[PDB]
Amino acid sequence: NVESFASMLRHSPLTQMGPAKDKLVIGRIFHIVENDLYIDFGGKFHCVCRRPEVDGEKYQKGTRVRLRLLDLELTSRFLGATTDTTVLEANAVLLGIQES
């Protein structure tokens, strides 16, 4: 009884989410540069969000925040290009801090 990859993919939380547009997820802040917060929400790419002005002091390393995903990966194909231009980051809108 060995779980196959298709079984792993089907039951994974990312797969059952469906489209990533307008989905509330929880991410973890791992790297902070000035006011730019790098938040990883379990996807392939992290998301960069500006530090909110209302409560910017609480946003630190390891803090868990709430995100509204807009795109797992930002790509777009421009004029004359043979492949999409990838930013190697995700697009999300910062909402607040997750509290239990």
Binding site: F78, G80, A81, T82, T83, T85
Partner: protein, 59 residues
């Protein structure tokens, strides 16, 4: 009849305008160009563009 005594007020108005125009021109040519007001400068924009170059070929 080109007498400056009777035209003191109007002369000063033109003289003041030249002072403002000269100062604004120097500020616009120096401070505004260096201040990067408005759109991003082409020198800084080209650095961003070359970070993601357009590829019309296959690699």
């Amino acid at each position: 009849e080109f007498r400056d005594d009777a035209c003191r007020k109007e002369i000063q108005g033109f003289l003041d305008c030249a002072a403002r125009a000269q100062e604004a021109r120097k500020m616009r040519s120096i401070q505004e160009t260096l201040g990067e007001s408005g759109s991003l400068l082409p020198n800084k924009l080209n650095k961003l563009l070359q970070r993601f170059p357009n590829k019309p070929y296959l690699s």
